[PDB]
Amino acid sequence: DKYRRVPMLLKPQQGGQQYFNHFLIRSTNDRLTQQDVDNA
Amino acid sequence: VSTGEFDHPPFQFRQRHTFNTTPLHDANRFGGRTAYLREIGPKKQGRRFKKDPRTVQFNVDVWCAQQTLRKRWKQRDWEVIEIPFRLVPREQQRVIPELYTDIPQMTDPARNDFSNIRNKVYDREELQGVLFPAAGAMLYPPLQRVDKQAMTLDKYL
């Protein structure tokens, strides 16, 4: 129907906010691992 | 908390036995107690009360009250015996108020017994000196209570 009374934060329902910092630290770890691979 | 049905389904178009849809008067609803209030066909005093909402709501309220009563009475493993004030145990030597008169009274806050006195149930085998003085033959045997300090299978011995 018309969901105009529903907020914009509820319509996609973007959950999973806990994993983002873990993903960023894993990305930094993989960048340093790639730097270790390129040097040797 | 209970998840049984309490209200009656409202009046609308005549339902059919489809998916997510039961007829308004079915033998599955309310244990078939809608059989008193149904019309099988697809005298005004016997036809008007089956279609009134307040009448069918009062009838299902009566049936749910009957179910609540039989489930509250099937919980009873006891009975009320009028025992005099002298022979009663120490927890009942007080002034017990009536139901819905005062705050729900704890049994003994000094002896660390925080429980309702109205829900207290006493064993029959501990009151044989009070309930049966005329027999004198010990009609019920003494209750064997387990030794909590004995080394058993529960305590790895």
């Binding site: 934060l9 509820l10 996609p12 959950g15 999973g16 906010q17 806990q18 910092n21 960023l24 | 998840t3």
Partner: protein, 423 residues
């Protein structure tokens, strides 16, 4: 034929020694028999092995994840109909998340501060030695010669600092010349980043290239250049209603005498209005994020209980959650005196909504006790999704009241947000 009950590995023996130390210390919950401590140690070693097995199977499952649409892999996200509905960020959301800074920028700022302090010390040393006044003529400005030659600065750096490399010493000579000329501005390096040598046309002339770069850098950081950039961005429609209102408020603060004194200059009367807009325009160096609200904690100092609220259908569902910290790790949730598994009739899709404010917060549910009081319409069962939505909002508001930084993920998940849908 007889399995030995004794600890068989050194890890088992170390855990048994820890359990014996705990039993001798008199900690609550530690068993007193030895067979129970043996059971405890064997179960803890099996739990550690199962955690290692789960970590290894997740490591293997990361490489075989079906990232494409296939036989059993279905999108169903509305990526065909709507397209890219779930957001994703590559930056740590401050101050909820933390990624450590890269070592290259750290070492660059460290070396820049070292060179700046060394050049300032050499400039102050020459100022003490030379005896005060030093006037620079027009031909001395056109020749770009200061009081010290490059040879004198190189000899001073070789004499005073023995451990000094060649290119570092040459960069120090260049920075001392730049600091004795004017206060040093770090603007030539970024102009070398954004403007290459082949674009302007100097491929064989590096000296004129660096001269043009330092001239553009010293002309960039003036007030008139910032005012012209702010006027250019005002012409390019880069403002919202908030910036228009702040420019109006800054125009209203100027009186007529200050307006005349500012219009005596050509760029200052525009700059007094457009200071905040030029702060916004300057990019990630000077524009701040708005960010979610971070409030103060409203916790009972005696009981440690925070109070949150939740609503649904406007009138029907109202809930109030009281939240406390459990220090014995036996946390449990209760709704109107009955535990949550019996209020919602063991339904996983309703109790997962109550678990969700602890999940998005990256918090353990067993470290918290919660009781939820129903204030709306009392019914014999609240096993539906809208009541569970109100329960989730109540638990999330209680978690926000207890720990304030929990509002940073919980507002992003939409758990603190109220919809207005009635019957």
């Amino acid at each position: 034929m007889q399995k030995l009950l004794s600890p068989r590995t050194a890890r088992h023996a170390r855990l048994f020694r820890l359990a014996g130390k705990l039993a001798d210390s008199g900690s609550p919950g530690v068993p007193k028999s030895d067979g129970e401590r043996l059971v405890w140690v064997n179960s803890h070693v099996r739990r550690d092995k199962d955690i290692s097995l789960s970590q290894e199977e997740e490591r293997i499952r990361e490489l075989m994840m079906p990232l494409e649409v296939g036989e059993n892999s279905f999108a169903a996200n509305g990526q065909a109909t709507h397209g890219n509905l779930f957001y994703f960020r590559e930056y740590p959301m401050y101050p909820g998340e933390y990624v450590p800074a890269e070592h290259n920028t750290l070492s660059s700022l460290r070396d820049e501060l070292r060179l700046d302090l060394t050049a300032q010390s050499l400039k102050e040393a020459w100022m003490r030695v030379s005896g005060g006044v030093y006037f620079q003529s027009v031909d001395e400005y056109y020749a770009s010669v200061d009081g010290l030659d490059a040879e004198q600065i190189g000899e001073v750096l070789a004499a005073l600092f023995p451990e000094l490399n060649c290119y570092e010493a040459q960069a120090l000579v260049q920075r001392t010349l730049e600091c004795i000329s004017r206060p040093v501005s770090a603007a030539s390096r970024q102009l070398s980043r954004t403007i290459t040598a082949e674009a302007v046309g100097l491929d064989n002339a590096p000296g004129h290239y660096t001269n043009f770069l330092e001239w553009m850098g010293r002309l960039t950081e003036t007030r008139a250049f910032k005012t012209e950039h702010a006027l250019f961005e005002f012409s390019r429609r880069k403002f919202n209603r908030d910036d228009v209102r702040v420019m109006f408020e800054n125009y209203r603060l100027m009186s007529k005498a200050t307006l005349l004194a500012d219009s005596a200059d050509s760029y200052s009367h525009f700059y007094t209005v457009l200071k905040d807009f030029a702060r916004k325009v300057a990019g990630e160096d000077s524009r701040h994020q708005i960010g979610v609200r971070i409030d103060e904690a409203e916790v009972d100092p005696e009981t440690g209980i925070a109070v949150g609220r939740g609503c649904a259908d406007g009138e029907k569902y109202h809930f109030t959650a009281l939240l406390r910290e459990n220090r014995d790790h036996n946390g449990i949730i209760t709704v109107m005196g009955k535990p949550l598994s019996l209020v919602l009739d063991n339904k996983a899709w309703l109790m997962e909504m109550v678990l969700m404010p602890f999940d998005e917060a990256n918090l353990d549910y067993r470290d918290f006790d919660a009781h939820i009081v129903s204030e709306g319409h009392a019914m014999p069962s609240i096993a539906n999704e809208i009541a569970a939505f109100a329960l989730r909002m109540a638990v999330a508001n209680a978690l926000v009241k207890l720990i304030p930084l929990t509002r940073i993920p919980l507002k992003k998940s939409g758990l603190l947000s109220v919809d207005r849908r009635r019957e």
